[PDB]
Amino acid sequence: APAPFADFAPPVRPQSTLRRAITAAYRRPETECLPPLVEAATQSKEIRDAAASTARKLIEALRGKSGVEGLVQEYSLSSQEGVALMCLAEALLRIPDTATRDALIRDKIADGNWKSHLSRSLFVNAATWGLVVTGKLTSTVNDRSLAAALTRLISRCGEPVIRRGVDMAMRMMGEQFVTGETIREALKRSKELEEKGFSYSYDMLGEAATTAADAERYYRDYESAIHAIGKASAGRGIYEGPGISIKLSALHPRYSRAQAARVMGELLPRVKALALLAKNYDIGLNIDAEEADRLELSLDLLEVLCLDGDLSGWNGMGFVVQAYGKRCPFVLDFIIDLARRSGRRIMVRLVKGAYWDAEIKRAQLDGLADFPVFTRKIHTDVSYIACAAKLLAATDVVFPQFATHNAQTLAAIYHMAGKDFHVGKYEFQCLHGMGEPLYEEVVGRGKLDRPCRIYAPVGTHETLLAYLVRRLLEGANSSFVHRINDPKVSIDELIADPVEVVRAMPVVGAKHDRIALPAELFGDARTNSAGLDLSNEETLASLTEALRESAAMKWTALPQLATGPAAGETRTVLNPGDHRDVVGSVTETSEEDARRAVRLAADAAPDWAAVPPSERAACLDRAAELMQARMPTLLGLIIREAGKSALNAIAEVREAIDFLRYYAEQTRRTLGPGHGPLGPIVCISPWNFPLAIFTGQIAAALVAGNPVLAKPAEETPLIAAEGVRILREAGIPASALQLLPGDGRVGAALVAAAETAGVMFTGSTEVARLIQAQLADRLSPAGRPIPLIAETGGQNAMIVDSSALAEQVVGDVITSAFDSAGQRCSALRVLCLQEDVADRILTMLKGALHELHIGRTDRLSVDVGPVITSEAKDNIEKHIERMRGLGRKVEQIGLASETGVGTFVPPTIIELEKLSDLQREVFGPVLHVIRYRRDDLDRLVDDVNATGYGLTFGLHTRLDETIAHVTSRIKAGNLYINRNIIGAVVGVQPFGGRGLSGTGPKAGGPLYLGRLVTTAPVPPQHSSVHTDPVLLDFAKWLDGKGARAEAEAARNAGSSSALGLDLELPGPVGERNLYTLHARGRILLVPATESGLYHQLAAALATGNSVAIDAASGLQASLKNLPQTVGLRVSWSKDWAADGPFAGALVEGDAERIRAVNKAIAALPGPLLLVQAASSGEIARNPDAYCLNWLVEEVSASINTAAAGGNASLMAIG
Amino acid sequence: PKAGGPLYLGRLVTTAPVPPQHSSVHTDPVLLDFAKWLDGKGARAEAEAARNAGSSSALGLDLELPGPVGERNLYTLHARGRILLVPATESGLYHQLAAALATGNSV
Amino acid sequence: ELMQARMPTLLGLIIREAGKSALNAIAEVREAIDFLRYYAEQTRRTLGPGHGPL
Ligand SMILES: Cc1cc2nc3c(=O)[nH]c(=O)nc-3n(C[C@H](O)[C@H](O)[C@H](O)COP(=O)(O)OP(=O)(O)OC[C@H]3O[C@@H](n4cnc5c(N)ncnc54)[C@H](O)[C@@H]3O)c2cc1C
Ligand SMILES: NC(=O)c1ccc[n+]([C@@H]2O[C@H](COP(=O)([O-])OP(=O)(O)OC[C@H]3O[C@@H](n4cnc5c(N)ncnc54)[C@H](O)[C@@H]3O)[C@@H](O)[C@H]2O)c1
Ligand SMILES: OCc1ccc2[nH]ccc2c1
Ligand SMILES: [Mg+2]
């Protein structure tokens, strides 16, 4: 039985002083990085003047010397027409036979009806063509605008414009974006510039392997290219002759620090084999630099390769360092030292860096201390020049390669390097089809007589467009190449010296004013929770120790009553991934003590209510600080108790911290003396988010002024007990927060207790239904229903069309379906693939599935942990076997023998014939896949809605028409576009569904606290200027009927309603997070009087709903002669169970009528209904007798606006 | 169509062009339900025409037009209202319904 | 272009024939100029051989 965390994340090798200096700089504050860079980049006044003169000369030559622009001009194309034309040209070039393409153009395309002859939107890559035509990036494509534009331009200009577009696109995609379609073509085309003194480095365009098969394909592409390049090099050697550039992410599908052992065992030999071939031909082999979290891992490969005697005698190994990265100079120190130790003259390509916007987004998403890159472009420029000075001092041991298109950067380095030059000392580098105009002013004895190596992409149209967006942005407003073409930018501006500009700033190295540090995403509202960087060796080393220390602790969970811990039945809590690992001990609550706890809560309710809201919120904020400080220990407990990986656990603790701070801030924004607490609230929580949901429900109830009976799931009491201990330490009195560990009997005893004033339940729909039935017999002392928030299961779908990028889909599917072994309520259950792409995506998905590591979660390398119990395992496996027995195709990972000591289900993909193959939620790592024809998309959305669930939903498409269609027709609480579907960032994706998935209001949203007080406050930003038109028609009808007071109440409800609220919530860059209030659906109205009916109808119509009115009320004659608009929304129901599902109910009557109606409502099939009841007198006295907060439905939509490959808004940030 | 607007010239030719900026990403939901109904009854050509009408309709276009500062000049396309349909054949009726529903109208 | 250049003379006629003030006569001529230029531009954006006249 292996000791917990004994092998959590050991480094590849002990970290040397040089390696530790790299890690120390990972997220160093920008103000600390810059001063040494300024010093190192400083040059004499004579050199600065000479450099500016050289830069001006180069820039004057550049400006003194278009294809798409000329086409746009000749045919008077709008921007959309230009984009549409290039998309058409791209599609026409997918026709191989040139004569067949020309015949289609002349006979069919030119005569209109291009739609008839061209499963895949023509405009799939329009975001890329948009960048080409307009210089602006859009994440998604307005395909209807492009279709209109294409029709218009073809009808106006005919075949000649199509011909010109085809020839333009052929030239760009075959000769500009790539040096050649194949390595042989690229080599033939390289002779011209090689004869002028250029060299080449070829890039076979491999990147981000998703499967073993992809990695093998990219391997054989590199190997075949090395042969072709080496044959062509013909002994020219590594400096004069061509080389190759490779990306490590192309060569293994799990290239990450978490998988370091697989990287060293499996990726390293592949690089070695390629390097051995490059050695034999004596060509350069350069390792390109990728994301910041791969930098230090790549150094371990570089170290092994440079120390491997089989590669000795060859100096062609190359390595890129990114000057936008804070570690760059320390990486260079490490590399220079490695070159000295190994005796290999490492080729070092200095670049600025290609992943800037992605690094900003990632650090914000992960809540990390700072960015691993600079945030002002001028800082990167200074870093580059400082790093060039370091490289130029070490030309005896490394070969510097200065990759840049910036004439100022170039000139600074040209003069820094001095007049002594020989081929092999250093070189410049540029990108094919971008840098030649500059470097034709550099290469050759008649220029600066310095060599330049051209980075030459090689590949087909399909491969080229995959990452052209990122490549073009390298096009942003701050980019030299964009600025050189901007007439408003003077040469003096372009030759400005970044070193002297930085040195003269008030605070040297200050962060960009318009980029939030991750902690500051929410500004003054609250402090973002902080995560942990699992790529940082210092963090991993410290976390290893804290995790081991957590496993030595004697964790317990006890019934913590107001009067002290109570005795009870005690049992061990076992690690679900290894039952031999005892995590702690739980003492469970007797049903007698549960009832006693509620009475103690009732007695303590006035004292807790009297704590001012701001002080209650201060307790939550203190608890959040305590949880943040204790995060490493909390991670260890969550990892061992609940089967979570470290990443799962970090998310869990961050979410708890965010709930605490969010509900604290919402309280400070809203709660006053008139928002009285309900009283004792029973908080019943699920095992699968054993700290986050647990803490969220309790914190909300407490801060609203209610004492809480906290009943954690029987599977996960220890982390709940620790959360209670933390809240109590933060100042929540023991009488206000009692912990009652135990199973559903303890929950049921709490729900049934006489003084229970509200229930917050998160768990399965079936259990929520039992609670709903229990509460249907109950009324408050005021004779009103006991509020129930019941957040329940999902049957969550993702729809993927033929415009989505398969690699992006597969990553988001693997994460959404199998993160936490599918034990997220948000997990993807049903993937819906458009038929034309289904086979390709499914193949990639199955390949990615088999790269997952399943096991006990106290290892960083484990992706997928166990299921929580043997009963959960048996239930999941029974479902899989039923599917397999029906003949459905089932793909499963093979599990290691070590899983036998725990309860594991392998990640599973099941191919369904119809969505009806699924019944209820299967809460495990089981992804179902269905295929759909594009024309059946609307029926498919109906089918998704027809399950009755409505929790999370994903859509992967680039096409605005499809986004608009799908998102308007889907009925789910949390929508995600071009990303995973498991996001629940508090206050950013307020989380919670509808139908079988929830009553609402959403946790982590602004309506939540208002449900926990007797009179709901007005939430921040909660209003709408829109008035429902059917409400208005009803108000006029009421006036025409003479119901004057009711017409006024109807108008007031129309104004009070927040239906139509449409907000963007602050969050990370590269995402848009939207929050909207819609109608709930059909509200069941159970009136008693005519006026009550009119008030109920006004409330429901003002919130956009339709209604079914109880026909047994006998009030049909009160609704004669309705306007058709209102009549369309009104039905009369004699059999309520036949006319559902409803989305809520409004009831009028005395206490016993309300109770009887509540029992009938609870008995209706399907979703739990949020019922509001009032007496006739309350309707007369209180305009808010029916609260409109609970008659609208919250919808959160999270859109990944970086999905096209770049961030448009950040293109203006430099 | 409005004088001084982008639909005007198209009324003065026998086949209307696609005006500048004339498109919408919105699809009328009743149109979509009608297309599904046509699908169900095997009216494949009409269902296709209905989906095509749903896409080519510019119902929901909502543009800000260039003009002077200190003013916002908006141009939007709404349903006309109730369209009188005078069909002769079942297929003609389905096509007329598709056209009218795709543009947000009742009939 | 001709209406723009001749606007002062056109104003005189509009003022006397149609009871317009100078400002409203200016608006009248400007609107005619704008129709001409707008329909010209809309034509350049749209009309091709398949859009036959009535
Ligand atoms: C031959 C060659 C090989 C390359 N290999 C790689 C590689 O392996 N890995 C890699 O990551 N990229 C690589 N690049 C790209 C390089 O990193 C740059 O993205 C690109 O060349 C633009 O830099 P520039 O100096 O030519 O132009 P510039 O316009 O001078 O610099 C633009 C760069 O500034 C940086 N930047 C922009 N905005 C900000 C900001 N707000 N804060 C901080 N920094 C900012 C970015 O790095 C951006 O690319 C390569 C480029 C070339 C020409
Ligand atoms: N909508 C959401 O936000 C959300 C979030 C997380 C989990 N969930 C759902 O939670 C479920 C998984 O959690 P789980 O397995 O712990 O759920 P569950 O329904 O098994 O148990 C939930 C809680 O209810 C208690 N309970 C069981 N029977 C009870 C009864 N008769 N009366 C009162 N309480 C009773 C349990 O002890 C536990 O505390 C999944 O269905 C998942 O989709 C929903
Ligand atoms: O990550 C590798 C990479 C990224 C961006 C680039 N641009 C030009 C070459 C190049 C290489
Ligand atoms: Mg259970």
GROMACS .gro file of C-alpha atoms in nm, chain B:
model
  107
 1215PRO     CA    1  -3.981   4.998  -4.975
 1216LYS     CA    2  -3.847   5.318  -4.820
 1217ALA     CA    3  -3.706   5.588  -5.040
 1218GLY     CA    4  -3.349   5.664  -4.946
 1219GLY     CA    5  -3.303   5.314  -4.816
 1220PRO     CA    6  -3.132   5.002  -4.942
 1221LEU     CA    7  -3.439   4.806  -5.055
 1222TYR     CA    8  -3.567   5.074  -5.292
 1223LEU     CA    9  -3.375   5.000  -5.612
 1224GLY     CA   10  -3.459   4.631  -5.590
 1225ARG     CA   11  -3.824   4.711  -5.648
 1226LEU     CA   12  -3.738   4.869  -5.984
 1227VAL     CA   13  -3.582   4.559  -6.142
 1228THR     CA   14  -3.737   4.225  -6.225
 1229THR     CA   15  -3.499   4.034  -5.996
 1230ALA     CA   16  -3.404   4.211  -5.676
 1231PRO     CA   17  -3.036   4.218  -5.578
 1232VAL     CA   18  -2.909   4.154  -5.228
 1233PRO     CA   19  -2.876   4.504  -5.079
 1234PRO     CA   20  -2.562   4.605  -4.891
 1235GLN     CA   21  -2.566   4.484  -4.529
 1236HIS     CA   22  -2.895   4.304  -4.590
 1237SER     CA   23  -2.884   3.986  -4.385
 1238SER     CA   24  -2.973   3.858  -4.043
 1239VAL     CA   25  -2.839   3.580  -3.824
 1240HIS     CA   26  -3.187   3.535  -3.674
 1241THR     CA   27  -3.412   3.254  -3.793
 1242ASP     CA   28  -3.781   3.282  -3.732
 1243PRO     CA   29  -3.871   3.001  -3.488
 1244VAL     CA   30  -4.213   2.940  -3.643
 1245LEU     CA   31  -4.045   2.902  -3.981
 1246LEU     CA   32  -3.822   2.639  -3.820
 1247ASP     CA   33  -4.123   2.456  -3.676
 1248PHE     CA   34  -4.290   2.469  -4.017
 1249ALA     CA   35  -3.983   2.319  -4.182
 1250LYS     CA   36  -3.980   2.034  -3.929
 1251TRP     CA   37  -4.349   1.972  -4.000
 1252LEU     CA   38  -4.279   1.962  -4.374
 1253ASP     CA   39  -3.993   1.720  -4.304
 1254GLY     CA   40  -4.228   1.495  -4.109
 1255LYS     CA   41  -4.475   1.468  -4.396
 1256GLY     CA   42  -4.205   1.404  -4.657
 1257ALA     CA   43  -4.244   1.741  -4.834
 1258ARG     CA   44  -3.869   1.742  -4.887
 1259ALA     CA   45  -3.848   2.010  -5.156
 1260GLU     CA   46  -4.075   2.242  -4.957
 1261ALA     CA   47  -3.888   2.183  -4.631
 1262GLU     CA   48  -3.566   2.273  -4.812
 1263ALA     CA   49  -3.725   2.588  -4.955
 1264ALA     CA   50  -3.850   2.672  -4.605
 1265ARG     CA   51  -3.504   2.638  -4.449
 1266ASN     CA   52  -3.354   2.843  -4.732
 1267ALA     CA   53  -3.614   3.113  -4.675
 1268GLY     CA   54  -3.541   3.112  -4.304
 1269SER     CA   55  -3.175   3.173  -4.378
 1270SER     CA   56  -3.210   3.431  -4.655
 1271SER     CA   57  -3.471   3.633  -4.465
 1272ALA     CA   58  -3.324   3.952  -4.324
 1273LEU     CA   59  -3.587   3.970  -4.052
 1274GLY     CA   60  -3.413   4.097  -3.740
 1275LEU     CA   61  -3.154   4.308  -3.919
 1276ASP     CA   62  -3.057   4.583  -3.678
 1277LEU     CA   63  -2.803   4.835  -3.808
 1278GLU     CA   64  -2.667   5.171  -3.706
 1279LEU     CA   65  -2.633   5.389  -4.015
 1280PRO     CA   66  -2.346   5.637  -4.056
 1281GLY     CA   67  -2.449   5.993  -3.990
 1282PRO     CA   68  -2.373   6.300  -3.781
 1283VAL     CA   69  -2.232   6.295  -3.432
 1284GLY     CA   70  -2.479   6.340  -3.150
 1285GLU     CA   71  -2.735   6.120  -3.322
 1286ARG     CA   72  -2.792   5.747  -3.344
 1287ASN     CA   73  -2.966   5.651  -3.666
 1288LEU     CA   74  -3.094   5.296  -3.655
 1289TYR     CA   75  -3.242   5.081  -3.927
 1290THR     CA   76  -3.423   4.758  -3.851
 1291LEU     CA   77  -3.625   4.497  -4.038
 1292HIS     CA   78  -3.940   4.367  -3.874
 1293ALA     CA   79  -4.224   4.148  -3.986
 1294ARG     CA   80  -4.475   4.324  -4.208
 1295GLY     CA   81  -4.769   4.187  -4.013
 1296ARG     CA   82  -5.035   3.959  -4.156
 1297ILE     CA   83  -4.982   3.854  -4.518
 1298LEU     CA   84  -5.274   3.753  -4.736
 1299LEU     CA   85  -5.193   3.421  -4.900
 1300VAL     CA   86  -5.381   3.336  -5.218
 1301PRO     CA   87  -5.247   2.992  -5.315
 1302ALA     CA   88  -5.358   2.765  -5.595
 1303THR     CA   89  -5.178   2.443  -5.505
 1304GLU     CA   90  -5.062   2.271  -5.190
 1305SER     CA   91  -4.696   2.316  -5.283
 1306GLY     CA   92  -4.760   2.681  -5.366
 1307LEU     CA   93  -4.921   2.727  -5.025
 1308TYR     CA   94  -4.624   2.566  -4.851
 1309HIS     CA   95  -4.386   2.796  -5.039
 1310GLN     CA   96  -4.599   3.101  -4.961
 1311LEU     CA   97  -4.617   3.002  -4.595
 1312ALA     CA   98  -4.241   2.950  -4.586
 1313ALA     CA   99  -4.178   3.296  -4.732
 1314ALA     CA  100  -4.420   3.466  -4.495
 1315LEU     CA  101  -4.315   3.276  -4.182
 1316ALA     CA  102  -3.945   3.324  -4.256
 1317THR     CA  103  -4.005   3.699  -4.245
 1318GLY     CA  104  -4.190   3.683  -3.913
 1319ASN     CA  105  -4.539   3.732  -4.047
 1320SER     CA  106  -4.871   3.577  -3.971
 1321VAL     CA  107  -5.093   3.479  -4.261
   0.00000   0.00000   0.00000
